[PDB]
Each structure stands twice: as structure tokens, then as C-alpha cells.
């Protein structure tokens, strides 16, 4: 990771776009110009955003680089950064850097920006407990458990991800600037202790409940909670629904496959004011009953409309053989459970037996 003779820039920096970056940084005339290690040692900062860089191979020869601005390139591989011991600021927004293993030994890193990288797994950040600012907006993150270790952060952006569980933030009392808009957050209790906040964003949450069956009268708990656990009164409820704390209530005489409610709450945490607002969506399943009649009385099964019915364990009667389930007692046709999926209405099937 050192040169000992004068060496052309392009021999070290194999990506032509990055070779041009170094040429301009060192005020050389051509990427073929020879440089010395003394010259490489003089590089403290590289600004090369939107520079069409695919690889930073060769950066390993720059031991003193402290600030690297590489937003809006084509990077996928940060292995060349792994031994840049003095790196303090690293900006990689709008790349395709998903593998974070090579950050492990960057123990002087203070600011890290990885927005718009398609990242889901941030567990590699466990190795950077000294971080002071971290920008992860516009990714695919759901699990922020690792952030409970980042107790030096004063600035954290997680906006535009898929986070519902913010409990890992609860002990991060150094936080001053926290961006959480456009996630799946319904419960602010985790934030109650963040008394040093100056800036807080909680806009535009989208929360999805697990599906339940449609019924004529539905009662769904309001799960939207303020920092003290008090429930946020809905701002508007779909489908003529009503609020009766602690529940949202609907009368749904016709099937519909979802209902929802919107919430809005001005929030104060620490010194920060924010507007916590969003939607809770409740998917509804269309479910009907198959009645299985055996000699004039029935067992019953609920099945979602349009889906496959699994036949019941068949009835047994000594001296008879079960034949099948028919749409009439003494007529109709035999139901085929492999091919005839659930009807959009309740119906009865009749057990038919035959002689041994």
C-alpha cells in the first residue's frame, strides 16, 4: 500500500474516472503523470460526487485521507477503504454499497452517509460505536437493533425505510437531530427519554395490521400511541367508522377488503416539535361457511372466498363406504376439492355413502 518510485496515476487508480479525480486533486496535467508516495500522502480530502466512478481501487495508497465525498457514483465494493485508518467523514449516498464488512476497522469515522443504497442489513454498524452522525434515509431497513450501541450519535436519519420497532433508540439520549418520516411507526413510547432533541421529523407513517375477517360490525383497537402511551385520536376514519376510545368501530354491511384510519398528533419531545401523522390500514378477508351435512345435521368450516377448500376428515359408518360430498342430499354433483375453490357465499354439501 505504498509506492517507492515515481508511478503513473493510472497505474495505481485503475478506474479511469477515479484516476481523473486524483489527477485533478493533485493538480497534475494527465493521468499518465508520475506521482510519488509523498504526493499521495498529501491527500487529506477527496470530493468526487457524481463522477461516474465504479471502483476506488488505488485509494489504499492514500493513508492520510480523512474526508471522502463519493455520492452519486456506481460503487458496490468498499474493500479498498478498509485500512484508511484516519477516515473521519464518508459520504456514499446514491451508490449500491450493501456489504458493510469493510467499515469494521474505521475506528475514527465520525460521519457516515449511506442513503439510497438499497440497504437492508445494518448489523455491520456494530463496529462503529464512536459514530456521531449517521444517514440511512431511503433504504430497505426494518431492523435497527444495532443502533442501541451507537451512544455517541447526535444526528440520525432513518427516513423512508420500513421501520416499525424504534425501541432500539430509547437509550440514545445524545440525539439532537432525528429523522423518522416515511416509516411504519405507530408507537412513540421509545422516544420519551430523548430530552436533548432539537429537530424531529415523524411525518407520513404507513402502518399495516395483520388481516382479520370481515364482519358486519368490526371493532379494532387503536394502536397509535404518543410518547407517554396515550392513544392518538383518529383524525378521520374510513367507511363511516367511529371512534370510541380505545377502539375504532365500523359497520360494514357489504364486504370490503380493507378499512383504515388516519391520525395526526403535534408532538413535543425534548426541545423539538414534530407532526406525527399517518395511516393505519386494516386488511379484511372475505370469509364464508361450508356446512357439511351428515344425515340432516352439520359441521361447519370457515373458508376465504376464492381459495382452496381442504376436504374434512371423511365420515365413517360401519357397513358403508363414504362416496363423496354432493351439492344435494340425493342429487346435484360431487364437489371436487382439488379444482372447485370456495364460493363467494355460504353453502351446504351433503355426505353420500355407498354399499361395501
Curated annotation (Swiss-Prot):
Keywords, sorted A to Z: Cell membrane, Cytoplasm, Heparin-binding, Leucine-rich repeat, Lipid-binding, Membrane, Repeat, Secreted, Signal, Virulence
Reported consequences of knocking out the gene: Deletion of inlB alone decreases host cell entry; the reduction varies from 99% to 37% depending on the cell line tested.
Domain LRRNT intervals: 1-41
Start and end residues of each LRRCT domain: 206-295
Keyword Nucleus attributed: no
Chief place of localization: secreted
Gene Ontology CC: cytoplasm; extracellular region; peptidoglycan-based cell wall; plasma membrane
Annotated LRR repeat ranges: 40-62, 63-86, 88-106, 107-128, 129-152, 154-172, 173-196
Region annotation (B repeat region) ranges: 285-356
Outcome reported for the amino acid change (mutating residue 301 to Y): No effect on cell scattering by the B-repeat fragment (residues 31-392)
Subcellular location: Secreted; Cytoplasm; Cell membrane
Gene Ontology terms, MF aspect: heparin binding; lipid binding
UniProt keyword annotation of tRNA-binding present: no
Residue numbers spanned by region Ig-like region: 206-284
Domains as described in the record: The N-terminus (36-79) resembles a truncated EF hand, the LRR region (80-240) has a curved form, while residues 241-321 form an Ig-like region; the whole region forms a curved tube. The LRR domain alone (31-241) binds mammalian MET and stimulates its Tyr-phosphorylation; the LRR plus Ig-like region (36-321) are required for receptor dimerization; adding the B-repeat allows the protein to scatter host cell colonies, and the GW domains, especially GW2 and GW3, potentiate MET activation.
Similarity annotation: Belongs to the internalin family.
UniProt subunit comment: Interacts via its LRR repeats plus the Ig-like region with the extracellular portion (residues 25-741) of its receptor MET; MET can bind HGF, its endogenous ligand, and InlB simultaneously. Probably forms a dimer upon interaction with host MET, which subsequently allows dimerization of the host MET and subsequent host signaling; dimerization probably occurs via the convex surface of InlB. Prevention of dimerization does not block interaction with MET but prevents downstream action.
Role, per record: Mediates the entry of L.monocytogenes into normally non-phagocytic mammalian host cells. Its host receptor is hepatocyte growth factor receptor (HGF receptor, a tyrosine kinase, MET) which is tyrosine-phosphorylated in response to InlB. Downstream targets MAPK1/MAPK3 (Erk1/2) and AKT are phosphorylated in response to InlB, which also causes cell colony scattering. Complement component 1 Q subcomponent-binding protein (gC1q-R, C1QBP) has been suggested to also act an InlB receptor, but this is less certain.
Name of the molecule in the record: Internalin B
Residues of the full protein shown: 36 to 391 of 630
Amino acid at each position: 500500500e505504498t509506492i517507492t518510485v515515481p508511478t503513473p496515476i493510472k497505474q495505481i487508480f485503475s478506474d479511469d474516472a477515479f484516476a481523473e479525480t486524483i489527477k485533478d486533486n493533485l493538480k497534475k496535467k494527465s493521468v499518465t503523470d508520475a506521482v510519488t508516495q509523498n504526493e499521495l500522502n498529501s491527500i487529506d480530502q477527496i470530493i468526487a460526487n457524481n463522477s461516474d466512478i465504479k471502483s476506488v481501487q488505488g485509494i489504499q495508497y492514500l493513508p492520510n485521507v480523512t474526508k471522502l465525498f463519493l455520492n452519486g457514483n456506481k460503487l458496490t465494493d468498499i474493500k479498498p477503504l478498509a485500512n484508511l485508518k484516519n477516515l473521519g467523514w464518508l459520504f456514499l449516498d446514491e451508490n449500491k454499497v450493501k456489504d458493510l464488512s469493510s467499515l469494521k476497522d474505521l475506528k475514527k469515522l465520525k460521519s457516515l452517509s449511506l442513503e439510497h443504497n438499497g440497504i437492508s442489513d445494518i448489523n455491520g454498524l456494530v463496529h462503529l460505536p464512536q459514530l456521531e452522525s449517521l444517514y440511512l434515509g431511503n433504504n430497505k431497513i426494518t431492523d435497527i437493533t444495532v443502533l442501541s450501541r451507537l451512544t455517541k450519535l447526535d444526528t440520525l436519519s432513518l427516513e423512508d425505510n420500513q421501520i416499525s420497532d424504534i425501541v432500539p433508540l430509547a437509550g440514545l439520549t445524545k440525539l439532537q437531530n432525528l429523522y423518522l418520516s416515511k416509516n411504519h411507526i405507530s408507537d412513540l413510547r421509545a422516544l420519551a427519554g430523548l430530552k436533548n432533541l432539537d429537530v424531529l421529523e415523524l411525518f407520513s407513517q404507513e402502518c399495516l395490521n395483520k388481516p382479520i375477517n370481515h364482519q358486519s360490525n368490526l371493532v379494532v383497537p387503536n394502536t397509535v400511541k404518543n410518547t407517554d402511551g396515550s392513544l392518538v385520536t383518529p383524525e378521520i376514519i374510513s367507511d363511516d367508522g367511529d371512534y370510541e376510545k380505545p377502539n375504532v368501530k365500523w359497520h360494514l354491511p357489504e364486504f370490503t377488503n380493507e378499512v383504515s384510519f388516519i391520525f395526526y398528533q403535534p408532538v413535543t419531545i425534548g426541545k423539538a416539535k414534530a407532526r406525527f401523522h399517518g395511516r393505519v390500514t386494516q386488511p379484511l378477508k372475505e370469509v364464508y361457511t361450508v356446512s357439511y351435512d351428515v344425515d340432516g345435521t352439520e359441521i361447519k368450516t370457515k373458508v376465504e372466498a376464492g381459495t382452496r377448500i381442504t376436504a374434512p376428515k371423511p365420515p365413517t359408518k360401519q357397513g358403508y363406504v363414504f362416496k363423496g360430498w354432493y351439492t344435494e342430499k340425493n342429487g346435484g354433483h360431487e364437489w371436487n376439492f382439488n379444482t372447485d375453490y370456495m364460493s363467494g357465499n355460504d353453502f351446504t354439501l351433503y355426505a353420500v355413502f355407498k354399499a361395501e
